[PDB]
């Protein structure tokens, strides 16, 4: 080996190397201190996290309306106990609430006889209701009770005086918060006079027991001005209405409707549905369902769906089912009135195995809506679209940004995305990852361009891109 001895090193390292060693040590310490000072400098002047909004329970997913239990299960199984067995499928849909009822006593057009505090024995006993509520609570499926005073008659609020009806409604609310329901729903408030006052009082009472309860109101008004009359005094009231009843089959018209409704109310929480107690398929053709579902699941609000809306159940294309409550189809034997009239393509059994079925899109969209922060409470911004397109951006803080493009037309078009309508923190990138499209024939996970993208007729694209 070759090295210097200890005494030799002490002889050699004495004269001037001490100064060099001390200078290097001081330089190292100064560099370390400057490093720490810089660390503090960037830490202080860094952009700050945005605060969470503390969402309620009717904010993180859709609701599922069940107009009548008789048609949900079929003959011989339309009971609360039978519905207790469907919670597996309902949780598979990833819903966050059930609009159940009415189940209260209403024989025919009799104010005194109509009791809102007693359960009709035909739909089950109170013990069945308690068991169903407990089972749903264990599975995190909140239950909302419908409280329409008259559902078996033409008038939903009786032709006589209504103050006794209001007292009965209030007693029903107090009783069912004793029972443990997580909200209420009333329908056909048009026929109700001075409905704003009763709605305010009922919100008052319902919120008086806890802050985790809600009241839902429904009406058939299709004009914008009337809804603001009801919402001018109540600000935490979900109001479902036929605001999107007319189709038009035009992207620009739907964009105008949505933007005007949002701007008129500001940015308050809303509910997106085409009716109060009707399916999507009543006003839409077959090809528009896969697009309307994406639009509903990608808009800021709480989507509201009816039963059979995930499999495209229709009553106008299958004789033997009333339009008010079509019989839900689970397999080929669900409709025995006309044998051989159903296909294993329009049942739940025949669509749980097909990736290309509508139920798969429903489940994927529900899963995406129920987990991603941007879809949960992100800001919604719409920019210039094409001849018949409707495009918008969902963005929250630093999370993944989402872009939605929808084509309501029947003729192939191009993207035509125009900038200078979004904040500086949500500028569109040149290339964005593609999540999904409403029709087969598109490659998922492939980064698509945003300057030459072409639209197939009746197609919608959902795309992602991280913070940029």
């Amino acid at each position: 080996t070759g090295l210097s001895k200890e005494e030799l090193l002490k002889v050699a390292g004495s004269p001037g190397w001490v100064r060099t060693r001390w200078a290097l040590l001081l330089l190292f310490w100064l560099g370390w201190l400057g490093m720490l000072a810089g660390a503090v400098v960037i830490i202080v002047r860094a952009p700050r996290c945005r605060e969470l909004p503390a969402q309620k329970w009717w904010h993180t997913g859709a609701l599922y309306r069940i107009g009548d239990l008789q048609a949900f299960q079929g003959h011989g199984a339309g009971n609360l106990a039978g519905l207790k067995g469907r919670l597996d499928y309902l949780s598979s849909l990833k819903v966050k609430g059930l609009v159940l009822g009415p189940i209260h006593k209403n024989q025919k057009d009799d104010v005194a006889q109509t009791d809102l505090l007693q359960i009709d024995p035909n739909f089950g006993s109170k013990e069945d209701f308690d068991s169903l509520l407990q089972s749903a609570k264990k599975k995190s499926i909140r239950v909302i009770l419908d409280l329409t005073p008259n559902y078996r008659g033409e008038n939903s609020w009786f032709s006589t005086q209504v103050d006794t009806v209001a007292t009965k409604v209030k007693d029903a609310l107090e009783f069912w918060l004793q029972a443990g329901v997580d909200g209420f729903q009333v329908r056909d408030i048009e026929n109700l006079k001075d409905a704003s006052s009763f709605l305010a009082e009922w919100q008052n009472i319902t919120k008086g027991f806890s802050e985790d309860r809600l009241l839902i109101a429904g009406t058939n008004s299709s004009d914008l001005q009337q809804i603001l009359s009801l919402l001018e005094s109540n600000k935490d009231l979900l109001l479902t209405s036929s605001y999107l009843s007319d189709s038009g089959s035009t992207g620009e018209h739907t964009k105008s409707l949505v933007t005007q409704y949002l701007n008129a109310t500001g940015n308050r929480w809303c509910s997106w549905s085409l009716s109060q107690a009707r399916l999507l398929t009543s006003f839409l053709p077959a090809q528009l369902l896969r697009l309307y579902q994406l639009m509903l699941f990608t808009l800021p609000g709480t989507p509201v769906f009816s039963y059979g809306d995930e499999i495209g159940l229709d009553a106008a294309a299958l004789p033997g089912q009333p339009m008010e409550a079509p019989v839900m189809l689970w397999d080929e034997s669900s409709f025995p009135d006309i044998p051989g009239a159903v296909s294993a393509n329009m049942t739940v059994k025949g669509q749980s195995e097909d990736p290309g079925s509508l139920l798969s899109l429903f489940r994927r969209l529900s899963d995406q809506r129920s987990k991603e922060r941007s879809l949960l409470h992100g800001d919604f911004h719409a920019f210039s679209a094409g001849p018949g397109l409707f495009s918008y951006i969902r963005h929250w803080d630093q999370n993944e940004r989402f872009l939605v493009v929808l084509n309501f037309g029947d003729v192939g078009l191009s993207a035509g995305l125009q900038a200078s309508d979004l904040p500086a923190s949500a500028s569109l990138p040149a290339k964005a990852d593609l999540l999904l499209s409403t029709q087969p024939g598109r490659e998922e996970g492939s980064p698509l361009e945003l300057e030459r993208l072409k639209l197939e007729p009746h197609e919608g694209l959902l795309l992602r891109f991280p913070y940029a």
Binding site: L3, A46, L52
Partner: protein, 456 residues
């Protein structure tokens, strides 16, 4: 017995338990699969530890992997393993621990958004340089400081386990029930399982460091198997219980969304006392870095005792008796590595190469069994352990090569570049006088600058 069991527990528990749970779960796809991957590692470590104990009692030479392989395979394999350990294993482990420290310190300031990368890197380098200076200044300071950090990490683990048990007794085990435990949000493939095991094996890394002190062990023959049997199951139980506490305190989706699982635990459970844990976690990371540096030095010494590394790396300070050049080289290598990769890519690198080295050593054990059947061995293990470990290692290596070719290929290439250096330096013994003059000049420059002499 208990004299060495303490060290076995100490070297295994670093900071991997504060990093792996997010990495494993994302690849496991369910609570049950992850909590099974943990126990799998807890047995694969035990098998390798038993085989290593057999090798260590077979050859009384100290040095661990470097000493055994050189005895069995020859100079080339020993030099290649030393090259891999010096360049990849230790620097990447140090970089991972430093990045974890920076993440845990910066998380409370930015709870919902990721912290800036520049500040995190600068803070990690500040911590690493401070610990390097501390290790260069003295040795007794380093020993006492390491003991205090070990106390801190044990306190943190005990607190987490206790809070988890208290929550369990309160009737909050929704995720642990079979209805929710086996809720697969992604179908787990074989390659994803291999990647999950690579991520989860980082928590057990460092179990072979005991073999570095075998010469200092009194009556290794009896205490070594007892130490292994006492230690490895206890470590597996502690890790599994900590994972159980994590899952009972927070949901898997929100667990995957956090850059510091422990910090989220402390925020939601400890309340006002939350600030207690991230400090107590940070000490743990400190206790990693320091400790690793020590082993690094005790490797370089050996690397010069066999004439594989330049002697300048083995010299100690004249006054303080500290190995300055080894620490300087380690700090430089770790700083270079930190700029390139992310935490989990580095974890994949180090886990892949660690398993490659373990498999090579076990195959060397088998070759020694074949070649020298008359060697006196105090303890003899059945062939089942080496054959099962070899099969598992081969499957894991091929599956990880298939899953992530780039990082494993880079590691293999870096290992393969060590052959020409060995052939040019040690195999080639006809060095021109220019090379000798350059080596002597660099050694003299290092000696004069760092004020170091060869150990006596």
């Amino acid at each position: 017995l208990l004299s060495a069991c303490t060290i076995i527990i100490g070297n295994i528990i670093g900071s991997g338990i504060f990093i792996s749970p997010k990495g494993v779960l994302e690849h496991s796809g369910s609570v049950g699969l992850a909590l099974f991957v943990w126990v799998l590692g807890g047995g694969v470590t035990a098998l390798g530890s038993l085989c290593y104990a057999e090798l260590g009692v077979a050859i009384p030479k100290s040095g661990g992997d470097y000493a055994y392989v050189t005895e069995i395979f020859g100079g080339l394999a020993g030099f290649l393993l030393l090259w891999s350990a010096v360049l990849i294993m230790y620097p990447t482990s140090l970089a991972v621990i430093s990045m974890t420290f920076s993440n845990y310190v910066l998380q409370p300031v930015f709870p919902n958004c990721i912290p800036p990368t520049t500040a995190s890197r600068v803070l990690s380098m500040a911590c690493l340089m401070l610990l390097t200076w501390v290790n260069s200044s003295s040795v007794r300071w380093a020993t006492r400081i390491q003991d205090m950090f070990t106390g801190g990490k044990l306190l943190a683990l005990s607190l987490i386990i206790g809070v988890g048990l208290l929550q369990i007794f309160q009737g909050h085990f929704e995720e642990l029930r079979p209805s929710n435990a086996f809720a697969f949000w992604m179908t787990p493939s074989v390659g994803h399982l291999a990647l999950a095991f690579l991520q989860g094996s980082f928590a057990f890394s460092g179990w072979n460091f005991l073999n570095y002190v075998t010469e200092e062990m009194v009556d290794a023959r009896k205490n070594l198997p007892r130490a292994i049997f006492i230690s490895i199951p206890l470590v597996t139980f502690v890790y599994t219980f900590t994972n159980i506490a994590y899952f009972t305190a927070m949901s898997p989706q929100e667990l995957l969304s956090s850059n510091a699982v422990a910090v989220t635990f402390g925020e939601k459970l400890l309340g006002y006392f939350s600030w207690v844990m991230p400090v107590s976690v940070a000490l743990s990371t400190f206790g990693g870095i320091n400790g690793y540096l020590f082993t690094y030095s005790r490797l370089c010494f050996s690397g010069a005792r066999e004439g594989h590394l330049p002697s300048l790396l083995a010299m100690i300070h004249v006054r303080h008796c500290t190995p300055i050049p080894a620490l300087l080289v380690c700090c430089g290598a770790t700083a270079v590595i930190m700029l390139v990769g992310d935490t989990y890519t580095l974890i994949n690198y180090v886990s892949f190469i660690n398993y490659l080295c373990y498999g090579v050593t076990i195959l060397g054990l088998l070759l020694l069994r074949w070649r020298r059947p008359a060697l006196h061995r105090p303890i003899k293990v059945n062939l089942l352990i080496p054959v099962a470990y070899l099969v598992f290692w081969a499957f894991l290596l091929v599956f990880s090569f298939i899953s992530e070719p780039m990082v494993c290929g880079v590691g293999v290439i870096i290992i393969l570049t060590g052959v020409p250096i060995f052939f040019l330096g040690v195999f080639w013994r006809s060095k021109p006088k220019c090379v000798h003059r350059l080596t002597e000049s660099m050694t003299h420059w290092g000696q004069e600058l760092c004020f170091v002499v060869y150990p006596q």
